[PDB]
Amino acid sequence: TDPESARGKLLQTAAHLFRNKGFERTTVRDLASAVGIQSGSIFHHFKSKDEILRAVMEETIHYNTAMMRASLEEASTVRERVLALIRCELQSIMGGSGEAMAVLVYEWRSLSAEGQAHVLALRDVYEQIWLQVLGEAKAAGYIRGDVFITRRFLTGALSWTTTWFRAQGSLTLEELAEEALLMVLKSD
Amino acid sequence: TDPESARGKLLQTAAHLFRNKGFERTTVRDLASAVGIQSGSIFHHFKSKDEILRAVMEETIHYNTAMMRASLEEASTVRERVLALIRCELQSIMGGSGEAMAVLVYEWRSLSAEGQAHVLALRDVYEQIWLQVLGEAKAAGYIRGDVFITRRFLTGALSWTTTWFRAQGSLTLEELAEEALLMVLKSD
Ligand SMILES: [Mg+2]
Ligand SMILES: [Mg+2]
Numbered sequence: 001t002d003p004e005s006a007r008g009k010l011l012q013t014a015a016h017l018f019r020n021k022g023f024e025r026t027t028v029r030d031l032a033s034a035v036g037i038q039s040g041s042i043f044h045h046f047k048s049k050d051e052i053l054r055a056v057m058e059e060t061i062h063y064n065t066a067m068m069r070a071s072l073e074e075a076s077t078v079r080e081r082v083l084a085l086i087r088c089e090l091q092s093i094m095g096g097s098g099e100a101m102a103v104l105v106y107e108w109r110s111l112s113a114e115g116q117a118h119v120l121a122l123r124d125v126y127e128q129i130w131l132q133v134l135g136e137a138k139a140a141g142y143i144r145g146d147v148f149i150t151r152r153f154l155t156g157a158l159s160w161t162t163t164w165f166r167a168q169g170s171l172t173l174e175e176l177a178e179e180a181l182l183m184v185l186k187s188d
Numbered sequence: 189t190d191p192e193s194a195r196g197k198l199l200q201t202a203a204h205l206f207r208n209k210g211f212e213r214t215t216v217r218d219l220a221s222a223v224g225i226q227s228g229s230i231f232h233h234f235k236s237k238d239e240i241l242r243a244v245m246e247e248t249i250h251y252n253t254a255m256m257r258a259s260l261e262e263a264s265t266v267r268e269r270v271l272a273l274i275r276c277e278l279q280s281i282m283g284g285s286g287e288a289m290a291v292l293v294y295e296w297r298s299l300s301a302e303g304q305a306h307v308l309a310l311r312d313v314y315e316q317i318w319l320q321v322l323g324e325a326k327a328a329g330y331i332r333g334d335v336f337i338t339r340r341f342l343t344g345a346l347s348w349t350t351t352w353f354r355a356q357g358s359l360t361l362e363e364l365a366e367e368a369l370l371m372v373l374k375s376d
Pocket of ligand 1: 012016
């Protein structure tokens with residue numbers, strides 16, 4: 001969405017308030033004061049506060065995915081396409097994608113069933129990009145195992161990096177992504 | 189420890205009470221009634237209730253590790269030794285190792301710093317078995333990447349299986365372990 005539209009100002013500013021204070025502690029008053037409007041005008045753009053949270057999360061995933069596809073477009077070989085997705089995912093895991101991603105992770109349980117189903121639809125599209133690229137890898141002979149299960153293991157291996165990557169000290173994210181590629185591909 | 193010794197009866201029975209009710213809700217009275225003793229006699233064997241929790245967790249790890257080493261002893265090839273550790277870890281992740289493992293995972297924050305350092309010492313030994321076996325694999329030419337980082341990714345990939353393995357329906361744990369082996373080894 002458009003950052004200068006009042007919708008965009010509201011979404012982008014809500015992302016910070018939610019990240020800083022929590023969704024539950026962020027009042028409708030808080031958001032209106034931050035955007036320089038009155039409480040009651042918030043609800044000209046979203047049907048509910050729950051819907052603002054849904055849109056913050058949708059925006060983050062739309063952005064991560066757009067970034068992924070753009071990186072893929074610049075990659076012409078199997079090894080570079082797999083590496084592009086690994087790097088994008090790691091960058092998202094390590095606080096790239098910013099406040100609105102941190103909101104997705106910690107405020108997940110604040111979102112309505114209906115909001116959640118919308119955000120999960122976007123996650124489905126994100127996963128299909130992974131499955132396309134890993135399916136290409138499998139077809140070219142770079143992946144030994146089942147494509148869907150390979151993605152499930154890689155999901156866990158990359159996510160877990162939050163528990164240890166900072167403790168390492170001298171390993172960069174690019175080196176981490178390269179090591180992930182060495183694990184998942186038979187050759188690169 | 190010895191299951192028929194009063195120490196063993198206490199530890200093995202505490203493992204259930206802690207798993208069923210939580211450590212915090214398990215009173216000294218509860219444990220004494222379950223073992224058929226008086227509250228005050230519990231503390232002839234352990235210095236504290238915190239120490240009973242430490243010993244439940246230590247026993248589980250000692251047992252998992254003993255099982256690991258035994259499986260390794262029956263494996264004569266690199267592929268079977270790596271698979272043995274993957275299978276043992278998965279079996280532990282999926283509710284093998286039983287009540288005392290579930291206690292380790294959920295009651296971790298109830299354990300004292302001193303108890304924790306003891307349990308972490310056992311985890312160190314467990315990890316060194318993984319590093320030995322993966323180091324053998326690397327030496328024989330089966331692993332492309334860094335041994336320590338390969339173990340960190342595999343830790344995350346196996347742990348994450350709790351979030352999805354039941355939803356699959358028809359995949360067995362042995363098949364899951366085989367798929368993990370296909371990912372981590374260049375050949376098997
Ligand atoms: Mg901003
Ligand atoms: Mg028992």
